[PDB]
Design a protein around this ligand. Structure first.
Ligand SMILES: Nc1ccn([C@H]2C[C@H](O)[C@@H](COP(=O)(O)OP(=O)(O)OP(=O)(O)O)O2)c(=O)n1
Ligand SMILES: [Ca+2]
Lengths: 392, 956, 393
DNA sequence: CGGGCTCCTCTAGACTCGAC
DNA sequence: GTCGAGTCTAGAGGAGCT
């Protein structure tokens, strides 16, 4: 199974009661180990550059994990209650039946609340980012952060794009974002047909698309699109509309708000399933370990010093390297290759006695399973080129 | 066993005096004793009895000679007899001609007659002439060496010059050194060749000894630093024809003559690479053979002269013992280098951050030509250089539109990538920036390029202008003819902005609280700064000297007192000066210390004592550094080593100052040594005593020298220190300067430097009182001048003659100070030789497991096994006693005072340091030796403690 | 001009003027970072991650939930998590009694999730997994950058960069001193005034040895970092049971590892560096400045100049250099105002692609440090920027 | 008339040679 | 034919030891 392999290779982390289909989608436990965290960080980096760096007028937003909290219904998100206050009321002076009802009313009425979606945080920063662009619509706000939803409390890491666009080109911008997100998901996928787009209608009748990933059990909405309109922005900014309307041409227009909400955690699960001898053929832009350095013969000290220099060079060049030469007990070469393939290691480098003589090292490629001899000085350039070619 | 002098000085105990001078000594001359009393009471010194120090009872080993002199002659002859035989075998040997072709094989090749080459493991004979060539590009591993034997030529080739592998181990071992194993090796710098010998790094002391032709040249026809400078410039003046410089070519010209030697113009071993050496193998081997043959001829011409001018075998034995120095290190040495370099880099990065920020802030003065109004940066190069030459939202674009816009942008960008043709092949260096900023920035092509003015340092002449240093409210100004100084505004006779100087001075005087108004050093009118006077900064050596950098360590008190201030204010100036003070030693010695040739022994090479000891760590390294010591590098025949004789002691504010503390004995071994107390001062006293009345303490100076104790702080150095209120380490400099020729001006300047409270008048009065004193020190000076002015200046103890360039016939009245100081300094060197000979004799007779570690001009450190540390301490005390007795005997005094009979304390420590109790706190070692490296404090023991611990015996 | 106002108008900060006071900023009760401030914090977190995980031997990532298991602790002030539906269900619908309401409130303090205040507990939960990853070969470590909640009653959020170092008790003090020096050097590396970063040994209520780093803010020193020489008590509390699952291989013998916690405040660190950096120029470190290149245009032909600027942008972005497209701004401003704006935004370089570039390719490059204008060819700009960024590191 | 050394960095000056 | 950049060396002032 894929979940067991990910757990043993530290892509996952949890008890067997937590590594189940229902539990994984819940988000009530830290389902990612160190390699899984690195893969999720690679996914976040690929999302960020493809949406905030390579895109025009898209800016970063950071918002709190707590919301002001209101007595409005249909809010199942867990609330914040001060522990000392509850101890003070229950102990010390004794309240009455009515007083405790008032205390519970106050908690519902006035208390913190855990955010359910990143949409509100971006909408709160609408004015500052509008002033950042000199009121020139359109512009977008992006954020990667953990959101809390009732299941216990589940945590899902969401990458949400709130795109402020004029009412005229709302459908065009929505289709633009839909095709761009579909290409982004399919860019890293060995099976890009497993990603699908379906037109969906909101409970208020608003239109959108739900990007799925065809998991082995069924499609899960890894990403959801909505044409929310001006309702949410008007709700979050009551009063004068002058601060709501942005400058688009000679007109001032309240921008329609588009929600592009992904699930980096569910996306990481999708890419782990897509990547799956036992080999996780993760895309080079996503694989957490890209070089594995090992020694092959004696002397240990000189070979270890050569490997240390090579590791320092690769780290200075931004390539993630697994120091496999530091293991006190090393397995066979075949076992190391199998372990690296299960861990989605792009390349394996073995430094031997011949390296001291001429600088030629045995380089192995995960995708082709073909050995190759390459000079030491030409390893770094080869890896950098390969990563650049895979990126573009 | 208590004895007394006719002048009441406590002499040796009866048991020791009977075994040293013997009974039957002649009674003192009554007239001489009365004269000594009259001289001694004239200065109010007669009387004042001294407490009788506890007596000593030791059964010394038999002195199998006739007296002290004969005993030392016999010891030295026994020690240096076989090496003399090996040297003589070279002089009477005929050698086959230089082989036509040199073998390319690895190892040692022996050239027989007619150039035939044969593979041999190691040279067979005992006497060799050695020269070693090292490819400096690939580190310190030896590359090739050529040797001459009394019967054949020898050549050596390393595996790195032949095999040509991609990568070689950066840590050296005995395996990749030059194997050479009662053996003598001759060479111009035997120490450099010795440092590349495999067997020399073992803890066990191989009996191989090294005779150096440069040391013998210094002994015979040596030159002082002034004499060397004059001789090189010219390359009474008859000393030039009899002396030469330390270069092998000059020595060969002086002693052997004939065709001049030529060096390789390519210099492949220093500037070239390994491939060049492979291509030019035969040419380099021929040059090495030429050097070896010249060294052999020089040795032939030098050995009889050295034996005639230094007839005492103690001199040769001491040189041979000084040629086998050995310093042990461990894995902590690498940690020391890393940590010192890291601390140096951190402090230098902080200093460079400050300097670069100041420089960048200064670059904004180009706008409006405001740099012409800056009191500091008006004189820099602010010139520039020209660059040399030969709407509504459109909406989301579709996929094809995005592709077209991406490809059009690339194509437009790539089209211009070929317009580079119009630009010079050589890239200009920052034409936009001002010239002074350009000089501070490395060029983009440099392999060590860093952003900003990375080249800035406190030693540059622009740094004080950036920091806006003001001396008493006067901006600092540099004069090429007078060094650094400052400008005093108000004079009324790019132009210097004297108006800015006046404004700054007015602001400073109104802020700090100040009011022809300044006196300082002196107004030099040759600088001719418009509207300003140039006053030189006060230098620690006088008004004649020039100040090269106001960031010297002697300006830190002036920085703290507020006379010297920095423009930005706050602690920036004090921090800069404190960083400079903490990094100056490492800035000057990091290449020396880091590039020390450390050969790490494998566990097999280590003895069973090191491995079996509990302190042994299987994960630690064990090696040794062989210091490259010239046994006679001065006219005084002292040792010379570029680093270890210049190794700074541990200081709380000096990075890398724990250098000697890093010389750590391996487990199972300890370092036992001692420092001679008031060595040269007592030598001068005992000389003056033997010239006045022939008894200890006859002169007033000898009486002052003998009476006192170091522990109680009443010795002559401590007495002077208490009198003038300075540290004893500075009273040493004061007294030695007075002894060696310093006038009253030097005394005044030294007192003012070391005692900031004293004024000029107080220092002058103190100096004149201590120099006016028919004086106390008259006899010493008279005897020193009499020995110096003799037709054959020789050492009063061993008879070693002065260099032929310093004889009165050759030089008449010139360099007389050097020739009068030579007597005392060469007497100290004879003291060291006698100590080495006696210590070797005691170690050999009583089987003390140890070897000579290092000696620096008064110290004798020994790598003794921990089981025999106190035996070594007793042996060293005995050697001190015997050396003092030998001095007294050769000077005619048939007795020895008890005060100078023994060391104050013998230091038994696990590492080399000035004091046992020091934990060596240092910026690079902030926790100390015990916390970081786990070195406990050893023991400093006087004679009585050693007697108690060893039962007064050297045998176990 | 105050630093806070400048950082607010340049979008390093955020919030109303009642949130820009010193107490409000220190509390962490509101989002205090604009897009530039978020990018600066991301750069600081990336530098921390590099220096503490990438270049450090045996340091691994870990992610833990913001919510910790509920505990009936005596005086913990950690805010609790309750379901609003259940509160309505108890209060409304069927009517309970006075005693029942007491039972519910006691149950909240008994069994309810609590927001984390430190990252130590999350790191200790993944200790066995990292033992498995390293084959139980001590020493190793777990690093994590996340948000921790501090009661202030308002709730304050602070980003914490913590490295829990598991070292044998023999070298605990040596490793603690090494980490103290390493963190102090790391904080001083990007600082214009390394003297403002200090250290001071301190002890806790249980007498454990420790040290705290400080930054001399204009109002006073604040503990931007803490290093505690914790014992084995935390591991035993998190792992009550067999010691065989906690012990790690120190050399040749198994030892329960001593725990060192190195907790730094990334938000407070960003504030410290904003004060350290601060004509009005924020001299932020080149490895921390949010915007590294800024591009402009000339005076026609606009289409070709734009095309060239688009190509140069793409070239700079593909190499991993953040770029501010100042040419696309339709608002016209003089080059003096543009340069002042770039200075206040800590923009390292401002590129001016003019019409003369279309002839040869000479673009005027202005550096923030010296404010001097230097001409360079377009093909050489990317290499120069990469070299500058790799050399400032 | 302090002496005996050691080495360093910085700077000025002269020499050499390629590109315009 | 000429200007500017390596490149090499020599001298001066500072700093370690004794
Ligand atoms: N500035 C100095 C320092 C030293 N020496 C010489 C004279 C000393 O005899 C010898 C050793 O120097 P010390 O500083 O050890 O002087 P002492 O031997 O008197 O000191 P101590 O009594 O502590 O051994 O070096 C000198 O001439 N000038
Ligand atoms: Ca001494």
């Amino acid at each position: 199974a894929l979940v067991d392999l990910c757990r043993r290779r530290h892509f996952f982390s949890g008890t067997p009661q937590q590594l189940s289909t229902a539990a994984l989608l819940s988000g009530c436990h830290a389902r990612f180990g160190p390699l899984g965290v690195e893969l999720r960080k690679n996914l976040a980096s690929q999302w960020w550059s493809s949406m905030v760096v390579f895109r025009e007028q898209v800016f970063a937003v950071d918002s709190l994990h707590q919301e002001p909290g209101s007595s409005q219904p249909r809010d199942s998100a867990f609330r914040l209650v001060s522990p000392e206050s509850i101890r003070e009321i229950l102990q010390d002076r004794e309240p009455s039946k009515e007083q405790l009802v008032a205390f519970l009313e106050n908690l519902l009425k006035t208390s913190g609340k855990l955010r359910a979606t990143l949409l509100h945080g971006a909408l709160e920063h609408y004015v500052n980012c509008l002033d950042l662009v000199n009121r020139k619509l359109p512009f977008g706000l992006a954020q990667i952060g953990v959101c809390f939803h009732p299941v216990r409390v589940g945590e899902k890491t969401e990458a949400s794009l709130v795109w402020f666009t004029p009412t005229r080109t709302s459908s065009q911008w929505l289709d633009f974002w839909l095709r761009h997100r579909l290409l982004w998901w399919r860019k890293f996928a060995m099976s890009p047909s497993n990603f699908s787009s379906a037109d969906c209608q909101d409970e208020l009748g608003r239109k959108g698309s739900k990007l799925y990933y065809s998991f082995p059990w069924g499609k899960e909405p890894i990403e959801t699109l909505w044409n929310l309109g001006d309702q949410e922005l008007l709700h979050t900014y009551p009063g004068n509309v002058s601060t709501i309307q942005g400058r688009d041409g000679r007109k001032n227009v309240v921008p329609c708000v588009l929600s592009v909400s992904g699930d980096v955690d569910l996306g990481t699960l999708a890419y782990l399933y897509d990547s799956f001898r036992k080999v996780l053929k993760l895309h080079p832009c996503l694989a957490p370990i890209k070089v594995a350095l090992d020694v092959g013969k004696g002397p240990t000290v000189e070979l270890r010093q050569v490997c240390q220099g090579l590791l320092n060079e690769l780290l200075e060049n931004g390539i993630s390297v697994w120091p496999g030469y530091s293991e006190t007990v090393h397995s066979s070469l075949e076992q190391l290759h199998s372990k690296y393939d299960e861990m989605s290691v792009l390349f394996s480098v073995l430094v031997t006695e011949t390296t001291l003589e001429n600088g030629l090292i045995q380089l192995r490629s995960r995708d082709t399973t073909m050995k190759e001899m390459m000079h030491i000085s030409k390893l770094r350039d080869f890896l950098v080129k390969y990563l650049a070619s895979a990126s573009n | 066993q208590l004895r007394l002098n006719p002048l009441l000085i406590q002499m040796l105990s009866r048991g020791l005096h009977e075994q040293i001078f013997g009974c039957g000594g002649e009674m003192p001359d009554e007239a001489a004793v009365q004269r000594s009393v009259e001289h001694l009471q004239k200065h109010g010194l007669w009387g004042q009895p001294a407490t009788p120090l506890p007596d000593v009872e030791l059964r010394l080993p038999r002195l199998f000679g006739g007296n002290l002199d004969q005993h030392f002659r016999l010891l030295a002859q026994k020690q240096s007899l076989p090496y003399l035989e090996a040297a003589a075998s070279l002089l009477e040997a005929q050698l086959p001609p230089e082989p036509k072709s040199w073998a390319w094989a690895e190892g040692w090749t022996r050239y027989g007659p007619e150039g035939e080459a044969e593979p041999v493991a190691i040279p067979e004979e005992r006497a060799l002439v050695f020269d070693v060539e090292v490819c400096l590009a690939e580190g310190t591993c030896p590359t090739l060496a050529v040797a001459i034997s009394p019967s054949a030529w020898y050549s050596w080739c390393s595996r790195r010059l032949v095999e040509e592998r991609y990568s070689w181990t950066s840590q050296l071992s005995p395996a990749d050194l030059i194997p050479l194993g009662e053996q003598l090796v001759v060479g111009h710098n035997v120490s450099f060749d010795r440092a590349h010998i495999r067997e020399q790094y073992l803890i066990q002391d191989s009996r191989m000894r090294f005779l150096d032709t440069m040391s013998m040249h210094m002994a015979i026809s040596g030159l002082s630093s002034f004499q060397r400078s004059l001789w090189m410039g010219a390359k009474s003046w008859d000393w030039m024809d009899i002396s030469s410089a330390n270069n092998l070519a000059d020595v060969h010209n002086l002693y052997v003559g004939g065709p001049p030697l030529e060096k390789e113009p390519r210099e492949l071993f220093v500037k070239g690479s390994m491939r060049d050496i492979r291509e030019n193998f035969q040419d380099l081997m021929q040059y090495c053979a030429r050097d070896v043959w010249a060294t052999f001829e020089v040795f032939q011409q030098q050995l009889p002269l050295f034996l005639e001018r230094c007839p005492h075998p103690v001199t040769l034995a001491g040189m041979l013992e000084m040629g086998v120095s050995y310093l042990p290190v461990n894995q902590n040495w690498e940690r020391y280098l890393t940590e010192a370099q890291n601390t140096y880099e951190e402090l230098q990065r902080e200093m460079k951050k400050s300097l670069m920020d100041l420089a960048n802030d200064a670059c904004q003065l180009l706008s409006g030509e405001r740099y012409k109004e800056d009191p500091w940066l008006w004189d820099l190069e602010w010139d520039l250089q020209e660059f040399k030459q030969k709407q509504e939202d459109p909406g989301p674009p579709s996929e094809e539109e995005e592709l077209q816009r991406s490809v059009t942008a690339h194509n437009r960008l790539q089209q211009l990538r070929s317009t580079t043709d119009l630009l010079p092949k050589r890239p200009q260096h920052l034409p936009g920036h001002p010239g002074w900023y350009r000089k501070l920035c490395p060029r983009l092509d440099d392999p060590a390029w860093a952003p900003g003015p990375s080249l800035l340092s406190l030693q540059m002449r622009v740094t004080p202008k950036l920091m806006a240093l003001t001396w008493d409210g006067f901006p600092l100004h540099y004069s090429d003819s007078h060094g650094w100084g400052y400008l005093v505004p108000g004079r009324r006779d790019v132009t210097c902005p004297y108006r800015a100087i006046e404004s700054l001075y007015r602001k400073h005087c109104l802020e700090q609280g100040k009011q022809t108004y300044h006196h300082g050093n002196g107004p030099y009118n040759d600088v001719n700064i418009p509207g300003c006077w140039f006053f030189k900064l006060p230098h620690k050596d006088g008004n004649n000297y020039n100040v090269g950098s106001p960031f010297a360590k002697d300006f830190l008190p002036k920085m703290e007192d507020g006379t010297l201030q920095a423009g930005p204010g706050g602690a920036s100036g004090p921090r800069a000066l404190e960083i400079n003070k903490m990094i100056s030693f490492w800035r000057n010695a990091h290449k020396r210390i880091s590039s020390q040739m450390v050969v790490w022994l494998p566990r097999s090479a280590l003895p069973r004592v090191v491995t079996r000891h509990p302190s042994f760590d299987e994960e630690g390294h064990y090696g040794a550094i062989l210091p490259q010591v010239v046994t006679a590098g001065t006219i005084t025949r002292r040792a010379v080593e570029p680093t270890w004789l210049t190794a700074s002691n541990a200081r709380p504010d000096r990075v890398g100052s724990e250098l000697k503390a890093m010389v750590q004995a391996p487990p199972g071994y300890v370092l036992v040594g001692a420092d001679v107390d008031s060595q040269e001062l007592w030598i001068a006293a005992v000389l003056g005593d033997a010239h006045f009345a022939g008894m200890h303490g006859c002169t007033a100076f000898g009486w002052m020298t003998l009476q006192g104790r170091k522990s109680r702080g009443t010795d002559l150095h401590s007495k002077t220190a208490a009198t003038v209120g300075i540290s004893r380490e500075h009273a040493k400099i004061f007294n030695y300067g007075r002894i060696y020729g310093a006038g009253q001006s030097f005394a005044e300047r030294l007192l003012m430097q070391f005692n900031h409270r004293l004024t000029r008048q107080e220092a002058a009065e103190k100096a004149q009182q201590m120099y006016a004193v028919g004086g106390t020190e008259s006899e010493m000076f008279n005897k020193l001048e009499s020995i110096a002015m003799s037709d054959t200046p020789r050492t009063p103890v061993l008879g070693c003659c002065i260099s032929r360039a310093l004889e009165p016939s050759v030089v008449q009245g010139e360099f007389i100070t050097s020739r009068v100081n030579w007597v005392v300094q060469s007497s100290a060197v004879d003291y060291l030789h006698l100590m080495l000979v006696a210590m070797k004799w005691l170690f050999e007779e009583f089987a003390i497991d140890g070897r000579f570690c290092i000696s620096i001009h008064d110290e004798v450190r020994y790598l003794v096994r921990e089981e025999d540390r106190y035996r070594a301490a007793l042996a060293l005390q005995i050697t001190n006693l015997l050396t003092r007795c030998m001095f007294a005997y050769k000077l005619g005094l048939n007795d020895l005072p008890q005060s100078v009979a023994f060391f104050s304390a013998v230091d038994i420590d696990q590492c080399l340091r000035k004091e046992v109790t020091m934990d060596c706190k240092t910026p690079s070692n902030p926790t100390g030796m015990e916390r970081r490296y786990g070195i406990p404090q050893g023991e400093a023991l006087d004679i009585y403690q050693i007697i108690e611990l060893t039962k007064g015996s050297l045998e176990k």
